[PDB]
Design a protein around this ligand. Structure first.
Ligand SMILES: Cn1ccnc1-c1noc(C2CCC2)n1
Ligand SMILES: [Zn+2]
Length: 140
């Protein structure tokens, strides 16, 4: 679990969205595993606007932050997970590192702020849902 809190937006894994997130829906995309909902209190997070391929992500299943190199956001085939089938996911960035299903929502951050959240795992890779293309998170 985990979320990005930017302005009055809450960014979560679409597969972990609550009834409240769906009841207060701003934007969702099953092919990115991303859902954004509206918040009452404003958020502490800034969004990276950058093409950085180095950063640090939180791994809840290790209680650790790991510096990683990661691929640019792409359309990637992902093997079946306990929360999704074997399928293509878009705007996905891969690095070498530990990602279990409960790691989804852990933040990946660079020198420019929040890059994305853990979305995929297994075979010693960790996939992140990029949010740096979502410029609209930075206003309204
Ligand atoms: C409707 N739509 C479709 C694709 N992207 C959007 C979207 N992005 O931001 C928003 C507005 C910004 C304030 C909430 N909608
Ligand atoms: Zn950056």
């Amino acid at each position: 679990s985990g979320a990005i809190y930017v302005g009055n937006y809450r960014v979560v894994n679409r597969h972990l969205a609550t009834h409240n997130d769906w009841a207060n829906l701003v934007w969702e995309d099953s092919s990115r595993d991303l859902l954004v909902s509206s918040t009452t209190a404003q958020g502490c997070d800034t969004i990276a606007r950058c093409d950085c391929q180095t950063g640090v992500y939180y791994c809840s299943s290790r209680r650790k932050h790991y510096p990683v190199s990661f691929s640019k956001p792409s359309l990637i085939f992902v093997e079946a997970s306990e929360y999704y089938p074997a399928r293509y996911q878009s705007h996905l960035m891969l690095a070498v590192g530990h990602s279990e299903p409960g790691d989804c929502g852990g933040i990946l951050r660079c020198q420019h702020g929040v890059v994305g959240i853990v979305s995929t795992g297994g075979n010693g890779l960790v996939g992140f849902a990029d949010v740096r293309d979502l410029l609209w998170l930075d206003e309204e």
